[PDB]
Design a protein around this ligand. Sequence first.
Ligand SMILES: CC(=O)SCCNC(=O)CCNC(=O)[C@H](O)C(C)(C)COP(=O)(O)OP(=O)(O)OC[C@H]1O[C@@H](n2cnc3c(N)ncnc32)[C@H](O)[C@@H]1OP(=O)(O)O
Ligand SMILES: C[C@H]1O[C@@H](n2cnc3c(N)ncnc32)[C@H](O)[C@@H]1O
Ligand code: MET
Ligand code: SF4
Lengths: 538, 800
Amino acid sequence: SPAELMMLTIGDVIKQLIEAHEQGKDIDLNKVKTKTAAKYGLSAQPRLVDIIAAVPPQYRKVLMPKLKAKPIRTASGIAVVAVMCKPHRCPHISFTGNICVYCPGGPDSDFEYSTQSYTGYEPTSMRAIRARYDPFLQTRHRIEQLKQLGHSVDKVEFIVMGGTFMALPEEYRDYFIRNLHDALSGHTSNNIYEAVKYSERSLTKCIGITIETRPDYCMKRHLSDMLTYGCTRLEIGVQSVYEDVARDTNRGHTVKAVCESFHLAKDSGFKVVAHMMPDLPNVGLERDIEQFTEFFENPAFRPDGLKLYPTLVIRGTGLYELWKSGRYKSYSPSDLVELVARILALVPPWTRVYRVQRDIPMPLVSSGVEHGNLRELALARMKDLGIQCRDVRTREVGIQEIHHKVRPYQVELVRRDYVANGGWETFLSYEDPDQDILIGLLRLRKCSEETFRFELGGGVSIVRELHVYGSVVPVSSRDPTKFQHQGFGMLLMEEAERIAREEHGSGKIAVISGVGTRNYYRKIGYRLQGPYMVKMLK
Amino acid sequence: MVAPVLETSHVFCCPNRVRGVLNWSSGPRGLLAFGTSCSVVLYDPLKRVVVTNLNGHTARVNCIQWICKQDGSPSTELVSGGSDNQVIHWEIEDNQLLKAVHLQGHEGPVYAVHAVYQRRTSDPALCTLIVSAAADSAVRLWSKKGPEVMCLQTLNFGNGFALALCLSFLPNTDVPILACGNDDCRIHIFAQQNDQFQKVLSLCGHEDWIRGVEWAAFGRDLFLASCSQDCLIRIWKLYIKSTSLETQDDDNIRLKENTFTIENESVKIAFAVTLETVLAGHENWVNAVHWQPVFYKDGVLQQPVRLLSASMDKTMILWAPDEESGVWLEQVRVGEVGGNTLGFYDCQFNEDGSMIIAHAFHGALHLWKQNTVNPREWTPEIVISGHFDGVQDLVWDPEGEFIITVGTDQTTRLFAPWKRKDQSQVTWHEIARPQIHGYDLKCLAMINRFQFVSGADEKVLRVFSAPRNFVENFCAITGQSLNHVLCNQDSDLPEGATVPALGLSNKAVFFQPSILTEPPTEDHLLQNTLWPEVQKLYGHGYEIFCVTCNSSKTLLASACKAAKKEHAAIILWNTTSWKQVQNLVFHSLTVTQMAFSPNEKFLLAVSRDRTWSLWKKQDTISPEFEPVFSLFAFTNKITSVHSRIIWSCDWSPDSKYFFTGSRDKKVVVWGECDSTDDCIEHNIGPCSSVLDVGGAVTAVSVCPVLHPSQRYVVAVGLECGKICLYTWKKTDQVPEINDWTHCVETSQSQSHTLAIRKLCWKNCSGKTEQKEAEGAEWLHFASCGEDHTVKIHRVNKCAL
Ligand SMILES: CC(=O)SCCNC(=O)CCNC(=O)[C@H](O)C(C)(C)COP(=O)(O)OP(=O)(O)OC[C@H]1O[C@@H](n2cnc3c(N)ncnc32)[C@H](O)[C@@H]1OP(=O)(O)O
Ligand SMILES: C[C@H]1O[C@@H](n2cnc3c(N)ncnc32)[C@H](O)[C@@H]1O
Ligand code: MET
Ligand code: SF4
């Protein structure tokens, strides 16, 4: 039978690998796989996961740096776990009578047992459906998969998806957040504060949480509530900078509300990521370029991250009815690629693009995008036109290392200042100028005159993000072929503490952080106050 | 006769989801103890029945630990800790409660408890030493001399925590010693010289959190077993150092000894600690570790050397040492590897080691027994089971041989009795779990003997029917006849059910044919015991809240959450061809409960808006058509007497009066609803006097038995889980005094701990007159609440 032949082939492969390790010579895996499969008479080849899932323990520890699969999953310095909430209705269904004109799925739809703005056939959607929307099971399952691939899960970040999370009853939000923290740490708590304490003392660090919210649910109350949870990032859907579009699609709010929410969130200390949608109705091929030029040149709009979602028409929505009646037509594919190239050429060097298109399966789409690799096609077109993309994602060491083959040689220090949302922003970085390679970054902001938090009033400057890229280095370990634990963090904080005292004129510095970061900043010399890590500068 | 005799018959519950909540006593005929919600339940595995509940806690129970004697007699004292900042010391006599003492002074929920008896020759009243650890980064010590307690000491760990504790005495002396496992991946040892505890030693080696330590005494040496989340188990060894002489064998390689010195009666004694071994074999976390207790065979004490461990990767391992070499070897590895189900929290031995028990992630209990002749074979056995979250509704078999419950744990369970030839007592066990749903369940109703309707946190009602193997299993276990239970009326029907590939539904498998003569275990219940779905009803705009059915088995009601008038509307269905019949628009808030009069000519509704309404059915012959309903009486703000939300209502057995209970701590009777022939408009109004029960009323029920003396007994439940039986009597005079009489009340161990959500008498309409009964000395009913518990109570007839 093929099964025992497969097993013997696998065992022989690990035997050769461990022998070669013992006498200490390098070995090529593909040739060994083919040769060993030839002997036992097979019609297939071994899979990497199978070879990983049969190593003895000590050898399992020693020889993972050769059998790892999908090296992109931890090429940015963290491990990402995505979880989903319970199905529910969007808050503006009541006082308007209906929801956005293009959103698919939801509690009242033909997509059975699916969350709003999702179909249920997606990877994460099918993971939570079989788990019946339980945060503990989802976290455990995803961490098990990540460990089975062969990655290190020392540092974790959560992403909470679904509809509007902050519109649910308080008890459910308590349940969800405390279960996430307990799943990481291993405790069995009763409320948020107990879970937060135990997670602070944990060994599997929780770097931060990300939540998606609407501009009318981002006020002082909601911001404070999210501050107690441990959240550090926000996702808001702007979709357009034009006031007529925001009311012809039954969005439910206005652009001025979006700007005010941006101002409050940035003064409180969060990070802002914006969803934008090209090819909206009543928006031609010339208003998109102006839209994005204003987006990146007007101080009221400048965000920290972007998500480009070209418009898709899906069955069971108002836009579907518009499309059937012969009143709405999509762009041609060449025009779409050209537009995306032009848009990507405008992104400033301090902005990071996380995703470039949706992930709806192709057969469910009636019109719109049909391919599945828009980003790389756009990059090739940009190379043809002679322009270049200079965002954050396509300039860091891991991406430059796996897509191209380059390494930093002549690292230098760079600083960029600007004005945004009524505040004076600075962006410090360590990067290689000649090859255009990014290593580590830090964001700093001087608090404006309209801050409401008690801890930040009276002359406080706040640090909003500190990050060093590369592959993941486990805590208290060192790897001379990677970039993390080599002192680029205490160099970036010493400079932030000099700007905040000699230029801002402040007398205190505050940091928003997770929990493992709490221990790190305690090591540096900061103390704890409220949900912040503060330090006197006098 | 002068006083009624209320007694409890059966209790169904499961342990909490905490580490160290289960503990098995030592000595012959010991008792198992675990914690459910706010109660400590004592369970007797040999008879497979629950003996009693100890309830004085106001929050979730976290730890339980028996106190071990020296003679080998069964223990009679134990200590518990709660998530209400307090510890409690209990005393037991004759399988009852004798006394309880509260120890207070913590500032967070407690999470670790231990206690021992003290040895001394002053003939004291059994002095006891207690140690506790909580979430306020502190460890506290207590002493209990008789009925008096006092706090000896407190220890502060900065911003750390203590996760495990154990107490014992140093060898060849009477100095207590303490071992504490911390989040620092480091064990701390304390010794009590003079009158206080002082740190002596710190042991390193682990590199993750520690989740259990245990002392053991072997000969003249002391052993310590430690487990962690490193997936590793370590054994240490403490002994008395030499006499500072006779040490001349320097031609050997030995580990460095960790030494300390203590003062005892003006004498210096030196002790040494050294590591013994490091076991391995687990993949996920190790949650608990335990030695084997000593026991007495024919007078002589036997002291085996064995170890037990339970892990998060669905496994248990038993370890024993090897005498040929210096290593330990696995002997038995028990569990079920595979499936999305997670692992175990706790594991326990028996008195002698014949049986082994384990506690699962959801709350299921697993029990294994060893064969007498084959010593490496273990088989599972029958254990208690129940919901792991709040129960919301309850129904009875129309003929009275099983009950069906739903809860916010997204499950539906069925309980039925077991009949065995070679015994007289009857015990009730779970045999069916006909739903594992994706929404929280709220309501249930019964249509036929093997068909029901369920309503959950969604806009859809569902209908479930029973497969074939269920009937065979039911008639086998309950002891009936297969031909007679079918009554030649069910005929051909599907065989089973299975989970669908996508979405939430049930699909007939016309699972596996598995005949059963004994109740199943918690691996056949999870998979092979579902029920097919045969209908699905739409027509509501929001999540369901209430369901009822008439006695003629052809109609059905419904309600949903609402904030306006166009959403709060009752809907009537059919039971032969499910379509909407008519919509009854009234009220502006949610309808909480409805009831059909036994005369099948009325329908009543109570709502959050402090009002109510009565709907009368008009009379037509029209055999092919269906009758209709319309308003017969109502109530506005002024006519309403309840000042707050109405929670329950019920009918009199003769369709004459009806009772309402609300949060206003009052139960009112509205009467003269009879004379349906021709009234001018109505005469409905208050027909009694209000009663101040003492707290919010959340359940009302009336016994379906008529007495010539015209007794109307009402079972009233409260938020605090009390059940009071009153006796209402119509005055028939213009004074309304002497209509409320208190008959009987539940005791402190027979009551619940949180709100009561349902009460239902046994309306055995199939047995209209009790043919085979002891003169019907007793009346049975059942209760459920938000304390994870379902209970069955029995009351004396002639007393009421
Ligand atoms: C605060 C926030 O918003 S999040 C910080 C970013 N989140 C991430 O962890 C992603 C990647 N982060 C990193 O690269 C690092 O964790 C940073 C940014 C915190 C520090 O970057 P580095 O340049 O690696 O720090 P640096 O080399 O100066 O310091 C190394 C020391 O920090 C320790 N350390 C690193 N991360 C942590 C942590 N989460 N908790 C505790 N100690 C930590 C290392 O163990 C090492 O200590 P040691 O070598 O003396 O034993
Ligand atoms: C989750 C995110 O998906 C985007 N989104 C919602 N509907 C559509 C659609 N039909 N096509 C493309 N993107 C869409 C919105 O930007 C929303 O914020
Ligand atoms: C999941 S959609 C994006 C978040 C939110 N519903 C918004 O429209 O802004
Ligand atoms: S708010 Fe977001 S999720 Fe809700 S309907 Fe609009 S686009 Fe969809």
